[PDB]
Amino acid sequence: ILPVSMTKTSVDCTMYICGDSTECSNLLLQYGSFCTQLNRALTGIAVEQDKNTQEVFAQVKQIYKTPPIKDFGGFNFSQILPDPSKPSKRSFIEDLLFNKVTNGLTVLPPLLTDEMIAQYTSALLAGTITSGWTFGAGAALQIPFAMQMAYRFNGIGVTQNVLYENQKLIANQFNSAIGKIQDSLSSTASALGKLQDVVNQNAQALNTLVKQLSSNFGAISSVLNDILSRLDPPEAEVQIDRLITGRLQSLQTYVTQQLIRAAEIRASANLAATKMSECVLGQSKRVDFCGKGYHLMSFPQSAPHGVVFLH
Amino acid sequence: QKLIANQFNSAIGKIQDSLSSTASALGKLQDVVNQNAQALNTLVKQLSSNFGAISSVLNDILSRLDPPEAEVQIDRLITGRLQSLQTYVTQQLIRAAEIRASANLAATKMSECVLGQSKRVDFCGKGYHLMSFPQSAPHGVVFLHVTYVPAQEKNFTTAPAICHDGKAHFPREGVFVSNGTHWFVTQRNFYEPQIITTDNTFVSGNCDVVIGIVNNTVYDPLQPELDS
Amino acid sequence: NVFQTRAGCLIGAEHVNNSYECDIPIGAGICASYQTSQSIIAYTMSLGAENSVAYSNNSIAIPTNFTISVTTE
Ligand SMILES: *[C@@H]1O[C@H](CO)[C@@H](O[C@@H]2O[C@H](CO)[C@@H](O)[C@H](O)[C@H]2NC(C)=O)[C@H](O)[C@H]1NC(C)=O
Ligand SMILES: *[C@@H]1O[C@H](CO)[C@@H](O[C@@H]2O[C@H](CO)[C@@H](O)[C@H](O)[C@H]2NC(C)=O)[C@H](O)[C@H]1NC(C)=O
Ligand SMILES: *[C@@H]1O[C@H](CO)[C@@H](O[C@@H]2O[C@H](CO)[C@@H](O)[C@H](O)[C@H]2NC(C)=O)[C@H](O)[C@H]1NC(C)=O
Ligand SMILES: *[C@@H]1O[C@H](CO)[C@@H](O[C@@H]2O[C@H](CO)[C@@H](O)[C@H](O)[C@H]2NC(C)=O)[C@H](O)[C@H]1NC(C)=O
Ligand SMILES: *[C@@H]1O[C@H](CO)[C@@H](O[C@@H]2O[C@H](CO)[C@@H](O)[C@H](O)[C@H]2NC(C)=O)[C@H](O)[C@H]1NC(C)=O
Ligand SMILES: *[C@@H]1O[C@H](CO)[C@@H](O)[C@H](O)[C@H]1NC(C)=O
Ligand SMILES: *[C@@H]1O[C@H](CO)[C@@H](O)[C@H](O)[C@H]1NC(C)=O
Ligand SMILES: *[C@@H]1O[C@H](CO)[C@@H](O)[C@H](O)[C@H]1NC(C)=O
């Protein structure tokens, strides 16, 4: 499992710092470009946060779609192939992934919507099966399935006669193995530990970023008007000098996190798009890059602000 | 060889006009520059701001004012102008670490995709990779990835083995195919049929366990040599 | 002539029931574009442009001819 994107937020600096004042907002004009160079910061995030998910998932020209007649030689994918019976068509395992996961502050919606994503990972996963890998290097080539696996063995050095001669017994070692996941997905809320914790850390910051509005910073009060209301412009300067300082200094502390954390996601996003390119669409030769053991293929599955590979 | 030369050459030409008439091809490099300049400007202008202090210029706070004024005033400048740096600095460090991540990517492409031939799918650009030509650009590098993309398909009927005598045969390299009479082993990524002789195949066991096997005469290279 | 998105109230562009590739991404899948009386239109984008492959357990498709591209990076 990997994170891919983090929640696109946006914070209007002006309003956070100075909520609702013509007074307060007249001091903040003096501190200069700060406010205006934050909103540029928090955008550069929100841009790329949609560039990530663009790069991971959509590597494919066209949306393929499965044939309605499923015969793969005994390999049973109905687990991972999507479900017409949901409103948004998400294969079984895709849904467990959803359930198991738990002042000027906006949150923007993601460009690609958690339904659309499910079309991609229902394309890759559906062009992986019929077309072999050749859809990554060109336009997909239908090839029988079990005449693919014979070409994902030669990749690991086992010669293909080890397939057709074992074919059945493999299918069960497969068809079973897929089954265990569900439990291990349903039994273990620590399967998702990665994604689960990202989403926390964000909402952990805001709850800290929000409580800041309650702080004295040495000023008389955390209600920005009760200063203003009670106390006079030649006085409330200093008192509001502090809050504007602190509440500002409390942004930068937050803005700096995001830039640091977002760069982290940005790094984990590339790792995905490298798997998703090499692992999914290819057969990866990089020992233990795609998971322990000689690697055969991999099936992407979307998860909220994340992606889950079955290797 | 000759055809391929052209397909190469023409593809070279188009690149020029993919550039000469389009500046937005350089968007990446174009941004890295802007964001830099976009900092300094934003940094420079911070000199003009008063940070609450009673003037922008230091001298004019120096001159006009008594030190016990100037002191308390000059702080606000400093503390402001100081803090403006730490912003500007941090932005660099964070940004300059991003570059470092994209330098370490080129130094990889340079090593693998140029000096070698990369097996990593779509690391060198869509399609099977052949070679790469670095070209320098201002504060950045531009690769010309020469890739191999297949084109014109033909359907075929394919079967994973062949019973000849009841042993199987599996193709040694690349699939079996048939166009409807003459089975053909072939290499996978390009269509070059060949009649099936033992050099193409290697026997494994006997039929039944194979699933989808098909009859045929797997030709015998030796046998005609025995006409004597 | 006002549209109601998931992202917000979008004033000044005419909804379209077609779906084309994205041009100016707005939010929640709604991509605006200028195509023609040329009026800014806003339309749910097609993720890719749909395809389907004919998969049948005995049938394979082998490219008979290739190309050579050159792709800047
Ligand atoms: C493929 O596996 C799925 C489950 O992974 C099987 O679905 C079950 O099918 C039986 C009918 O034999 C139903 O009674 C069950 O309710 C199904 N399970 C679920 C969770 O819906 C399916 O039978 C298998 N099919 C093939 C062709 O392998
Ligand atoms: C190869 O290994 C697999 C598992 O490691 C064996 O699969 C099981 O074999 C037993 C035989 O005692 C069967 O009863 C089971 O039905 C098999 N599993 C499944 C899922 O079908 C397999 O037997 C091994 N082969 C050899 C020759 O030892
Ligand atoms: C293989 O494909 C190439 C191009 O994809 C073909 O080359 C072109 O062929 C046409 C006529 O068939 C000529 O008019 C073009 O000038 C050729 N291109 C170039 C760059 O010279 C080639 O003919 C194809 N070969 C087969 C057997 O299909
Ligand atoms: C399948 O391809 C084979 C290989 O060409 C064809 O067999 C030969 O086809 C050529 C076509 O120029 C004829 O001149 C030969 O006489 C054929 N060989 C024999 C022994 O007849 C075959 O015709 C093709 N079949 C189909 C249905 O396309
Ligand atoms: C390939 O031809 C063989 C002939 O060697 C077929 O095997 C025969 O199958 C029939 C069907 O019941 C039996 O009556 C014969 O006894 C089998 N032959 C022998 C020698 O025992 C086989 O069915 C054919 N299969 C394919 C896929 O072509
Ligand atoms: C292969 O067969 C399918 C049949 O569904 C057809 O649609 C497709 O066009 C065929 N491809 C070629 C190259 O003839
Ligand atoms: C392929 O599927 C067809 C269904 O039309 C079936 O009749 C045939 O036995 C199958 N053969 C193989 C090799 O999968
Ligand atoms: C989309 O289609 C529905 C029914 O087909 C129609 O009522 C609606 O007016 C259409 N919307 C636009 C923007 O054309």
UniProtKB/Swiss-Prot annotation, chain A:
Site residues (Cleavage), renumbered to this chain: 90-91
Consequence of substituting residue 201 to H: In strain: Omicron/BA.1, Omicron/BA.2, Omicron/BA.2.12.1, Omicron/BA.2.75, Omicron/BA.4, Omicron/BA.5, Omicron/BQ.1.1, Omicron/XBB.1.5, Omicron/EG.5.1
Consequence the record notes for mutating residue 103 to K: In strain: Omicron/BA.1
Span list, region Heptad repeat 1: 167-217
Disulfide bond residue pairs: 13-35, 18-24, 279-290
Glycosylation sites: 76
Impact upon substituting residue 274 to I: In strain: Gamma/P.1
Outcome of substituting residue 228 to F: In strain: Omicron/BA.1
Impact reported for residue 39 to K: In strain: Omicron/BA.1, Omicron/BA.2, Omicron/BA.2.12.1, Omicron/BA.2.75, Omicron/BA.4, Omicron/BA.5, Omicron/BQ.1.1, Omicron/XBB.1.5, Omicron/EG.5.1
Highest rank taxon of the organism: Viruses
Effect of residue 106 to N: In strain: Lambda/C.37
Coiled coil: 196-240
Function per UniProt: Precursor of the fusion protein processed in the biosynthesis of the S protein and the formation of virus particle. Mediates fusion of the virion and cellular membranes by functioning as a class I viral fusion protein. Contains two viral fusion peptides that are unmasked after cleavage. The S2/S2' cleavage occurs during virus entry at the cell membrane by host TMPRSS2 or during endocytosis by host CSTL.
Protein name as it appears in the record: Spike protein S2
Source species: Severe acute respiratory syndrome coronavirus 2 (2019-nCoV)
Upper classification of the organism: Viruses, Riboviria, Orthornavirae, Pisuviricota, Pisoniviricetes
Residue window of the full protein shown: 726 to 1064 of 1273
From Swiss-Prot, chain B:
Effect of residue 182 to Y: In strain: Theta/P.3
Glycosylation: residue positions: 155, 179, 215
Disulfide bonds listed in the record: 113-124, 163-207
Coiled coil: 30-74
Region (Heptad repeat 1): 1-51
Consequence of substituting residue 152 to H: In strain: Kappa/B.1.617.1
Domain of life: Viruses
Result of altering residue 108 to I: In strain: Gamma/P.1
Function: Subunit of the fusion protein that is processed upon entry into the host cell. Mediates fusion of the virion and cellular membranes by functioning as a class I viral fusion protein. Contains a viral fusion peptide that is unmasked after S2 cleavage. This cleavage can occur at the cell membrane by host TMPRSS2 or during endocytosis by host CSTL. In either case, this triggers an extensive and irreversible conformational change that leads to fusion of the viral envelope with the cellular cytoplasmic membrane, releasing viral genomic RNA into the host cell cytoplasm.
Protein name: Spike protein S2'
Organism: Severe acute respiratory syndrome coronavirus 2 (2019-nCoV)
Gene name as annotated: S
